[PDB]
Design brief:
The PDB classes it as viral protein/transferase. This is part of a larger assembly, with chains A, B and C. Chain A has 15 helices and 45 strands. Chain A is α+β, with helices and mostly antiparallel strands. Classes of the chains: A alpha+beta, B little secondary structure, C mainly alpha. The complex binds myristic acid.
C-alpha cells in the first residue's frame, strides 16, 4: 500500500573515480520465466494510481532542484521548450500523459510551468507520430524528457536494446539546444551501456543525476544530464557504485520473496504455501462426547496457530453451521513440525455462543490499511534471530512471550527454554524434541546454573523491564550481564535501548529526551530509560575479555520483510521507513564470548580521522570493509579503495595490525578478516560512524533589502549538511520556490521579501541522505517577525488557497483569490512569481500599511 | 544475448560451437566480377 | 539500386573484416582448431567499442559462418 519511494544519486567531484568496467552487471537469469512471474505478481497487487503520472511527478520535482555552481541556479528554469518523447496516450481517456496539464497548471510545488510541450511517440494522440531512434525533422528544445520503451523496437534480447539506448541518447543529445538538459529512461541497465555513456556523453555535460522511483520490483532507471554540449571531465564515482549495488540487491531480495506467494487469483486447496484454511460443522454439538469436531478444530489450530483465527455461526440450507477461517504460512507449518502428539483444545469458549454471526468471503491479504509500526519492528527483529540460529543449537530465550513466537521461528530440532513471568498457554505434552517453560524473572538470581544453552536472546523486553522495576538502563544491563556471567551460554542476542547516531526525534512515534536518558512511546504511553554506546561496551568487555561485539545493521535490508508477505501482512512504504528510523535507536547487540576483539581508537565522526588497531594476526592476512553489503575496501589493494581514506600498518614486534581511516557516510560499517591462503572467512566486530551535529545558528542583519536583490543572511552550518527549504500546507510538505531563496558561498542565503512571508512559516530542511528533514528541520521563526515599511514599495502575493482580503490601514481594497477580482491601476504584477505554488502570481503594491484577515 | 524466457536460437557464447579453420573452407565473398565492357556487349 | 545498397554497408563490411582478420580464420594447409568460448572471449576483448558486432551479434555470427 502507500505511495512510492524515490532514490537518487548525484555527481560529486570528491569521490573516488570508478570506471565504467566495474559497475554491477545485471543478473543473467533475469529473463528466465519464474522471475517474470514474480515481476507480474508483484505489479498486479500494487495499490497505486497512474504509474506514469507518479513517476514523472517524482522525476520532475527532483529535476527542478539541481544547481549550476557556475551560475548559482537551476539548469531548469521556466518557459523551457520541453520535448516529451514517448507520449503514450493512456487508455484513461486523457489521450495524453497524465502530468502535462498539472505541470503547466503549476499544480505542483517546485515545478514552474513551462512554455509549451511537444508530444512525440508511437502511441501519441495529441502530438506527432514517429519512431525516434532514427532521424526525424524537428526544432530545438531546451529540456527533453524521455519515457521511451525499449522492449518494443529491437527484437527480444539485450544487445539490440543496448544499441537502442545509444541511439536514444544521441537523438536526445541533438534535440536539446546547447546548455539544455534531458532525462532518459532505461529498461535494462547493462555494463556496455555505461561504457558507451562514459566514453561518449560524460565529457559533454556539466552535471548528471540518476533517479529511481520504486513502484514495482523491477530494474527501471532514469538518467539525467545537464549543460549539454559543454565540456567537463565527469566520470562515474563512488556513490554511483554504491547506489547500483543497492539498486540490484533490493531487487534480488524482493524478487526472491515475491516468488513464493500463490498466483494472483488462484485456487487454494492446501498444497499452496499460503492459503485460507477453513472448516465447518453442520448442526454442531459441544456439551457431550463429540470426539468428532474436538479433533476437527484442533487440527486446524495446529495447522495455523498463533495467527489470527476468525469464526462465524449461522445457518445454511436448514442446517446450523459453524465456520472457522485462518491462514497458513511457512512459520505456522514449521510449528507443526515440532509436535509429536496432537494438542487438544477446550471448547468451553464456544458452546456458550447464543448469538448469531454472519459468515464472510475469504480474502487472503486481509489488511486494508497498511501494517502498523511496531508489529513490523518486531518482525524485522525476529528475522535476525530466525536467521542466526542453525539446526540443533540449544536455545535459551529470555523474555519469551506467553504465545511463544519462538516455537514458530526456529527449526524443529532445537531445544528451547521459555523464561518469563506470566504463565504461557502453549501445551505441554505434545513436543517431539525438548521444550521447557518457566515462571520466574530473568532479571532475578539463583536459577542459572541448571540450564543448558548456546544462544541467549532478549527482544523488545529489557527497556520495559528496567522501566517497570524503576531501574535505569545502565543498572538493568549490568544485572543482565551478571546473570549471564555464571551461565554456560556461547552467544548473546540482546535488543538495547541506546542510540546509534545523532540524537533526534521521530514525530508522534518516539520522542526522545536528552536531559534524562529517556525515550517515550506515545502510541504506547510510557517513559523508559536508555544509555550510551561507549558506556555499555565496557560492561560487556568486563565479564568477557574475549568479547567480540557487533551491532548488526538493518536500515537497508529487506530480507526481514519475508516474515510478512508469507502470511499476508500487507505492507506500507511509510511503515517501513519509520521502522528503520525507530531501529536506529533500538539496535540489536550480537555478542560472541570468544570472538576476536576490536578496539576503537580515534574519533568516529564523518569528516574525521578514525583509527583502529586489530591484534592477534599475521602479516599475510586481509581485511574487508562492507557497507550495505557493498565493499568499502580491502587491505590487499589499499589504493583502489572506495572509501575516502585508508591506512595499513603492522607491528612485527607484537603482531598487531593497524588501520587508520576516514569515512564519508554515517551509520554502520563492518570489518571482516581473511586468514590464510584459504577461502575461509572470519567475522570480526562491526563499528558505527555518526554524522556531525545537527545544530544550526544564523545571522540576520538590521537593514532589509525589500527590493529585488533582497537581503542576504548568514546561516552557520557544518558543510556536510546540504540545505533547502520547505513549507507545511494542509499538513503536507511543499517545495519552496527555488526563485525565492538562494543558498551560495562561508554560507549566505538570498531572499526576496514580501508581506506574504509574514503569514507563512518557513523551514530549512536537509536532503543529503535518502530521507529529508530527519536531521535538520529548522523553522525560521525570525521570518515571521519582520517589521514592514510604509514609505516603501512592496512585493506581495496571496498566502494560500484561502480567501485573504487586503486592507490599507484597516480598509479593504480588493480580495485575493476572488471571483471577478480586478487589478488596481497602481498595483503591478511581476514576471516570475515568488509564490510557493507557481500558479499564484505576485504583485507590486505601492507604499502603505497592508493587513490581511482570514475569512 | 537471450532476450526471451524461452530460447530457441543459437547460443553464441554457448557450448557445442565449432571453430575448425581449414584450407578447404578458405573464406571469400565476391572479390571481383568480369565487368569488362567488351565482354558485356 | 545495387550501387546504393552497397553504399550503405560500407562500414558493416569493415567491422566484419576486422572480426575475421584480428585472428587467423584461414590456414594454408590441413586444418587447425580452437574452442569457441576462448575465441569469443577474445573478440569481446579487442573489437573497438563502436564495432557493429557489439550491438548486432547473432547476424554477424551467421554472416561469418555464411
Ligand atoms: C546474453 O546473455 C546477452 C549478453 C551476452 C551477449 C554476448 C556478448 C555480446 C557480444 C557478442 C559476442 C561478444 C564478442 C562480440
Amino acid at each position: 500500500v502507500g505511495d512510492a519511494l524515490s532514490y537518487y544519486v548525484d555527481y560529486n567531484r570528491s569521490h573516488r573515480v570508478v570506471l565504467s568496467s566495474e559497475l554491477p552487471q545485471l543478473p543473467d537469469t533475469y529473463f528466465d520465466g519464474d522471475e517474470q512471474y514474480g515481476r507480474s505478481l508483484f505489479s498486479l497487487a500494487r495499490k497505486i494510481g497512474d504509474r506514469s503520472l507518479v513517476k514523472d511527478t517524482a522525476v520532475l520535482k527532483h529535476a527542478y532542484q539541481a544547481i549550476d555552481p557556475n551560475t548559482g541556479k537551476e539548469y531548469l528554469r521556466s518557459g523551457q521548450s520541453v520535448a516529451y518523447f514517448g507520449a503514450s496516450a493512456g487508455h484513461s481517456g486523457a489521450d495524453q500523459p497524465l502530468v502535462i496539464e498539472p505541470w503547466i497548471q503549476g499544480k505542483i510545488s517546485g515545478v514552474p510551468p513551462p512554455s509549451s510541450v511537444r508530444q512525440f511517440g508511437y502511441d501519441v494522440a495529441r502530438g506527432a507520430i514517429v519512431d525516434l531512434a532514427r532521424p526525424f525533422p524537428s526544432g530545438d528544445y531546451q529540456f527533453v524528457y524521455s519515457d521511451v520503451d525499449q522492449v518494443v523496437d529491437g527484437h527480444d534480447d539485450l544487445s539490440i536494446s543496448s544499441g537502442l539506448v545509444e541511439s536514444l541518447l544521441s537523438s536526445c543529445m541533438h534535440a536539446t539546444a546547447p546548455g539544455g538538459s534531458f532525462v532518459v529512461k532505461i529498461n535494462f541497465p547493462t555494463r556496455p551501456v555505461w561504457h558507451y555513456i562514459e566514453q561518449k556523453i560524460l565529457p559533454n555535460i556539466t552535471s548528471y543525476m540518476l533517479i529511481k522511483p520504486f513502484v514495482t520490483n523491477n530494474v527501471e532507471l532514469f538518467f539525467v544530464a545537464f549543460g549539454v554540449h559543454q565540456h567537463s571531465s565527469l566520470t562515474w564515482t563512488s556513490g554511483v557504485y554504491f547506489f547500483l549495488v543497492d539498486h540490484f540487491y533490493r531487487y534480488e531480495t524482493l524478487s526472491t520473496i515475491s516468488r513464493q506467494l500463490p498466483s494472483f487469483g488462484y485456487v487454494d486447496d492446501g498444497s499452496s504455501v499460503t492459503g485460507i484454511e477453513t472448516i465447518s460443522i453442520e448442526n454442531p454439538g459441544f456439551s457431550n462426547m463429540t470426539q468428532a469436531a474436538r479433533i476437527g478444530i484442533s487440527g486446524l489450530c495446529a495447522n495455523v496457530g498463533n495467527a489470527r483465527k476468525s469464526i462465524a455461526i449461522y445457518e445454511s440450507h436448514g442446517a446450523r453451521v459453524l465456520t472457522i477461517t485462518s491462514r497458513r504460512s511457512p512459520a505456522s507449518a514449521r510449528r507443526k513440525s515440532r509436535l509429536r502428539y496432537l494438542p487438544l483444545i477446550d471448547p468451553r469458549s464456544l458452546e456458550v455462543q447464543a448469538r448469531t454471526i454472519l459468515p464472510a468471503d475469504p480474502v487472503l491479504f486481509e489488511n486494508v490499511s497498511g501494517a502498523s509500526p511496531h508489529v513490523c519492528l518486531t518482525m524485522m527483529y525476529n528475522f535476525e534471530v530466525s536467521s542466526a540460529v542453525y539446526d540443533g543449537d540449544v536455545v535459551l530465550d529470555l523474555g519469551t512471550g506467553p504465545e511463544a513466537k519462538i516455537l514458530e521461528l526456529i527449526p524443529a530440532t532445537s531445544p528451547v527454554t521459555c523464561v518469563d513471568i506470566r504463565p504461557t498457554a502453549q501445551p505441554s505434552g505434545c513436543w517431539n524434541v525438548r521444550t521447557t517453560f518457566l515462571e520466574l524473572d530473568y532479571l532475578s538470581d539463583g536459577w542459572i546454573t541448571g540450564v543448558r544453552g548456546d544462544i541467549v536472546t532478549c527482544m523488545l523486553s529489557l527497556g520495559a523491564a528496567a522501566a517497570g522495576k524503576s531501574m535505569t538502563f545502565d543498572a538493568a544491563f549490568q544485572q543482565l550481564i551478571k546473570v549471564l556471567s555464571k551461565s554456560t551460554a556461547n552467544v548473546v542476542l540482546v535488543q538495547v535501548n541506546c542510540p546509534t547516531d545523532v540524537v533526534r526525534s521521530i514525530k508522534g512515534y518516539l520522542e526522545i529526551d536528552s536531559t534524562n536518558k529517556r525515550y517515550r512511546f506515545p502510541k504506547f504511553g510510557r517513559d523508559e530509560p536508555y544509555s550510551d554506546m561507549d558506556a555499555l561496551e565496557k560492561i560487556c568487555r568486563t565479564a568477557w575479555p574475549n568479547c567480540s561485539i557487533t551491532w548488526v545493521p538493518l536500515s537497508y535490508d529487506l530480507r526481514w520483510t519475508r516474515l510478512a508477505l508469507l502470511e499476508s501482512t500487507t505492507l506500507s512504504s511509510a511503515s517501513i521507513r519509520i521502522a528503520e528510523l525507530m531501529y536506529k535507536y533500538m539496535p540489536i547487540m550480537r555478542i560472541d564470548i570468544h570472538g576476536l576483539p576490536m578496539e576503537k581508537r580515534g574519533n568516529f565522526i564523518v569528516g574525521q580521522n578514525c583509527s583502529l588497531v586489530i591484534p592477534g594476526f599475521n602479516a599475510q592476512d586481509v581485511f574487508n570493509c562492507y557497507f550495505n553489503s557493498a565493499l568499502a575496501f580491502s587491505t590487499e589493494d589499499v589504493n583502489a579503495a572506495m572509501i575516502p581514506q585508508v591506512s595499513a600498518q603492522f607491528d612485527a614486534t607484537k603482531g598487531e595490525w593497524t588501520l587508520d581511516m576516514v569515512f564519508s557516510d554515517a551509520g554502520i560499517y563492518t570489518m571482516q578478516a581473511l586468514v590464510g591462503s584459504n577461502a575461509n572467512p572470519v567475522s570480526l566486530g562491526s563499528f558505527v560512524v555518526d554524522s556531525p551535529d545537527v545544530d544550526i545558528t544564523d545571522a540576520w542583519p538590521a537593514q532589509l533589502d525589500f527590493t529585488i536583490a533582497g537581503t542576504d543572511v548568514d546561516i552557520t552550518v557544518n558543510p556536510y549538511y546540504r540545505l533547502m527549504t520547505f513549507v507545511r500546507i494542509d499538513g503536507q510538505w511543499q517545495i519552496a520556490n527555488p526563485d525565492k531563496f538562494q543558498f551560495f558561498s562561508t554560507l549566505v542565503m538570498n531572499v526576496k521579501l514580501d508581506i506574504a512571508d509574514k503569514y507563512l512559516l518557513y523551514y530549512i530542511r536537509d536532503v543529503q541522505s535518502r530521507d529529508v528533514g530527519f536531521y535538520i528541520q529548522h523553522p525560521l521563526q525570525l521570518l515571521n517577525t519582520i517589521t514592514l515599511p510604509t514609505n516603501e514599495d512592496l512585493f506581495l502575493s496571496a498566502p494560500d488557497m484561502r480567501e485573504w482580503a487586503v486592507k490599507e490601514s484597516g480598509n479593504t481594497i480588493c480580495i485575493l483569490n476572488s471571483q471577478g477580482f480586478v487589478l488596481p491601476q497602481d498595483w503591478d504584477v511581476l514576471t516570475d512569481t515568488i509564490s510557493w505554488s507557481p500558479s499564484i502570481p505576485t504583485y507590486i503594491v505601492p507604499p502603505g500599511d497592508y493587513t490581511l484577515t482570514p475569512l | 544475448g537471450n532476450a526471451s524466457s524461452i530460447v530457441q536460437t543459437i547460443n553464441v557464447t554457448g557450448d557445442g560451437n565449432v571453430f575448425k579453420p581449414s584450407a578447404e573452407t578458405s573464406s571469400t565473398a565476391v572479390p571481383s566480377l568480369s565487368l569488362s565492357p567488351g565482354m558485356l556487349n | 539500386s545495387i550501387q546504393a545498397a552497397l553504399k550503405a554497408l560500407e562500414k558493416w563490411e569493415i567491422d566484419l573484416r576486422v572480426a575475421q582478420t584480428l585472428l587467423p580464420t584461414n590456414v594454408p594447409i590441413g586444418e587447425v582448431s580452437c574452442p569457441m568460448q576462448s575465441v569469443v572471449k577474445l573478440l569481446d576483448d579487442q573489437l573497438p567499442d563502436d564495432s557493429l558486432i557489439r550491438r548486432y551479434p547473432k547476424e554477424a555470427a551467421v554472416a561469418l559462418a555464411k
